[PDB]
């Protein structure tokens, strides 16, 4: 689908927050996440799946206030809990506007492409991350993208992030290319 | 389910 389809799709999905918030940096992190292909942003949409958009903390959100003083998974001697933690995605999405980079509390590529990616393995793809095909893609390029420690060794983290490097830009889409070329054909044959 | 993005 084009990008005017995808927005069409994102404004039926995407909830902007009650408060006061970067209306326009709002709409940037809708147009990152119209770069994904459209068949998983439909899927998402016939699931019912909402891409919250926050102006605070996480867990100032009535849905995630049972996260507070949480720590998150793999975010173990970060001395941070989901308190600081300025997305979330799998069986729901909910992001910080204005801490898409890299860098806002997070290393990576882009907070919402990561975090919907976690969604779409989740809740459209039957949590492909942990099918035995990618498993053995994981086993050989986990550790091609950078954060080896992390990436390497959560299978849907390295789904995520390579999600996001592959639908971000052209740039990170050839750079996933020359770094990760069996993870790159999976996701280009995922999306036909 | 819910998933933290990269440290
Ligand atoms: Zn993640």
Redesign the interface.
């Known amino acids: 689908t084009t990008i005017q389809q995808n927005k069409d799709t994102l404004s039926q999905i995407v909830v902007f927050p009650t408060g006061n918030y970067d209306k326009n940096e709002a709409n940037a992190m809708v147009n990152r996440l119209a770069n994904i292909d459209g068949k998983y942003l439909n899927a998402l949409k016939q699931n019912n799946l909402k891409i919250k958009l926050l102006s605070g903390k996480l867990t100032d959100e009535k849905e995630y206030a049972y ?1 507070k003083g949480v720590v ?4 173990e001697g ?1 001395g ?1 809990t ?1 308190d600081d ?8 999405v909910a992001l910080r506007i204005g801490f898409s980079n890299k860098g806002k ?4 590529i882009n ?1 919402e492409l ?2 919907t990616a ?1 969604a779409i393995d ?1 809740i459209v793809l039957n949590d492909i991350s942990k099918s035995a095909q990618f498993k053995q893609i994981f086993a050989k390029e986990g550790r091609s993208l950078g ?1 080896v420690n ?2 390497g060794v959560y299978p ?2 390295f789904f ?2 390579s999600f996001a490097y592959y639908y971000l830009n052209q740039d990170t889409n050839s750079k996933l290319k020359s770094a990760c070329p069996q993870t790159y054909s999976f996701l280009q044959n995922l999306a036909k | 389910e819910v998933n933290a993005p990269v440290p």
């Open positions: 996260l998150p998974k793999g975010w970060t941070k989901w933690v300025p997305g979330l995605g799998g069986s729901t509390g997070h290393d990576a907070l990561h975090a976690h989740h954060n992390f990436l849907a983290e995520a992030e």
